[PDB]
Structure 1
Amino acid sequence: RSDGRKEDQLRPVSIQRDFLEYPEGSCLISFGKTKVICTASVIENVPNWLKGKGQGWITAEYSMLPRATQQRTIRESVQGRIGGRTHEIQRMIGRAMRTAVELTKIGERTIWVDCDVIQADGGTRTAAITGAFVAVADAIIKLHKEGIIEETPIKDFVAAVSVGIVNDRILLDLNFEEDSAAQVDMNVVGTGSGRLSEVHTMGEEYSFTKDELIKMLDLAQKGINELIELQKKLYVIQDGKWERSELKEVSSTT
């Protein structure tokens, strides 16, 4: 590989919690040059279609600072048109966070997740999912510690990774060059207990076989395991009770 990384090998991962002071939960996560600030903020209200239904909600906002992929990514603000890509990813991130939380026990409140890509080199949405989880878990633990809620209703860890087929090679965690050069690429969202939350595989003018898909899904699930092993070092859990470990930062030894 370009950067001398093995095919079934992730880039250097780094997750730093308590990145910012104001949000209930926050972290700066990085997969190589890809960097994402993930924050979780509690809004003491709920969408209207949920009112009175004894449940909370989680929603996500994603944004890519104009300086991404060492190119230009002008925001959906001072430009006009609003990309349907940003929404696709926001919906993804929201779906991952919601799958991981028992919203029943969160109360009639909303956790507003914000993923700000401050540097892009491929895999920015999976890095955002992986980091967003940390921020959401921390925010729920914070809410508990503040007595706003009884327990810490977090179902399981959640992480994501990309995998692709490049020049007929199956690669894990693609940077931006490998991804643009890919025949087939995909995104997997998995849980701590080894299950899956989402898998999107797309042929880029090339088609693939069911078996190629399984090979990829297998390498991805291994990537999710490594990412979740990192995430696990930040918590001390017992019988569904979540507390933060004393680590403020975890990183892959590579």
Structure 2
Amino acid sequence: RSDGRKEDQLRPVSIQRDFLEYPEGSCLISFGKTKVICTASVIENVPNWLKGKGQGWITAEYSMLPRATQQRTIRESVQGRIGGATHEIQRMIGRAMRTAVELTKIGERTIWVDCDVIQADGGTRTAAITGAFVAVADAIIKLHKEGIIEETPIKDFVAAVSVGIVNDRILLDLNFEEDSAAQVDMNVVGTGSGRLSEVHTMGEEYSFTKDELIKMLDLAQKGINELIELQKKLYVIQDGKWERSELKEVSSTT
């Protein structure tokens, strides 16, 4: 591999919590050169269709700064035509966060998750999910400490990683080159207890077999468990009660 990494090896991972002051939860996660600021803010309101249903909500906003993959990713602002890529990814991150939380116990308020990619070199949506969880868990713990809510209704850890087939090799966590050169690539969103929340496999003008898929899904779940072992170092949990550990940052031994 271009960087000298094994085929079943993650890039150097780093998760820093309390990155910013204002959001209830926030962090800067990085998978190699891919860097994402993930923040979680509580809005004391709910989407109209939920009003009165004794439940809370989580929704996400994703944006890539114009300096992605050392190129130009001019945001949707001073442009006009917004892309469906951003929405596909925003919908994914929202689905991951809500699966990890028992919204019944959050109350009628919304956790607004913002993922801001400040440097892109592949796996940005998987870095974003992994980081967004840390920010959501932190924000729920913060709401609890403030007395806004009774417990910390977090069901389990959530992380994500990419994997793919490149020159007939199955690689874990692809950077931008490996991915533009991939025959097949996929994103997997797994949980702390080994289950799956989401999996998308796409043949890029190449088809694949159910067995190749399984081979990739197995390699991905291993990556997901390594990222989750990192996230775990940031919390102290017991009987569904979550407290932050004393770490402000965690990184892989790589």
Q: TM-score range by the shorter chain?
A: over 0.9
Q: Secondary structure at the match of 2:142?
A: helix
Q: Secondary structure at the match of 1:85?
A: helix
1:76 aligns with 2:72: no
Q: Secondary structure at the match of 1:48?
A: coil
Alpha-carbon distance between aligned partners in 2 of 1:92 and 1:174, rounded to the nearest angstrom:
19
Query: Which aligned pairs between 1:37-56 and structure 2 lie closer than 5 A?
Result: 37-56=37-56
Q: Secondary structure at the match of 1:22?
A: coil
Deviations for 1:118-144, whole angstroms, at most 9, x for unmatched residues? Answer: 000000000000000000000000000
Q: Secondary structure at the match of 1:134?
A: helix
Deviation of the 1:236 alpha carbon: 0.1
Alpha-carbon distance between aligned partners in 1 of 2:127 and 2:108, rounded to the nearest angstrom:
29
Q: Secondary structure at the match of 1:219?
A: helix
1:23 alignment partner in structure 2 = 23
Alpha-carbon distance between aligned partners in 2 of 1:65 and 1:181, rounded to the nearest angstrom:
23
Deviations for 1:7-45, whole angstroms, at most 9, x for unmatched residues? Answer: 000000000000000000000000000000000000000
1:142 alignment partner in structure 2 = 142
Q: Secondary structure at the match of 1:90?
A: helix
Deviation of the 1:68 alpha carbon: 0.3
Deviations for 1:98-131, whole angstroms, at most 9, x for unmatched residues? Answer: 0000000000000000000000000000000000
Q: Secondary structure at the match of 2:39?
A: strand
1:227 alignment partner in structure 2 = 227
Alpha-carbon distance between aligned partners in 1 of 2:100 and 2:179, rounded to the nearest angstrom:
28
2:169 alignment partner in structure 1 = 169
Deviation of the 1:229 alpha carbon: 0.1
Alpha-carbon distance between aligned partners in 2 of 1:117 and 1:198, rounded to the nearest angstrom:
21
Alpha-carbon distance between aligned partners in 2 of 1:64 and 1:196, rounded to the nearest angstrom:
26
Deviation of the 1:176 alpha carbon: 0.1
Q: Secondary structure at the match of 2:68?
A: coil
Q: Secondary structure at the match of 1:117?
A: strand
What do you get for the CA RMSD once the two structures are aligned?
Answer: 0.2
Report percent identity of matched pairs. 100
Deviation of the 1:83 alpha carbon: 0.2
2:113 alignment partner in structure 1 = 113
Q: Secondary structure at the match of 2:36?
A: strand
Deviation of the 1:96 alpha carbon: 0.1
Alpha-carbon distance between aligned partners in 2 of 1:102 and 1:28, rounded to the nearest angstrom:
25
Alignment gaps of 5+ in structure 2: none
1:189 aligns with 2:189: yes
Count of aligned residue pairs for this structure pair = 254
Alpha-carbon distance between aligned partners in 1 of 2:20 and 2:253, rounded to the nearest angstrom:
25
Q: Secondary structure at the match of 2:128?
A: helix
Deviation of the 1:92 alpha carbon: 0.1
Deviations for 1:35-57, whole angstroms, at most 9, x for unmatched residues? Answer: 00000000000000000000000
Query: Which aligned pairs between 1:195-210 and structure 2 lie closer than 5 A?
Result: 195-210=195-210
Deviation of the 1:84 alpha carbon: 0.3
* TM-score where L is the length of structure 2: 1.00
Alignment gaps of 5+ in structure 1: none
* TM-score where L is the length of structure 1: 1.00
Q: Secondary structure at the match of 1:37?
A: strand
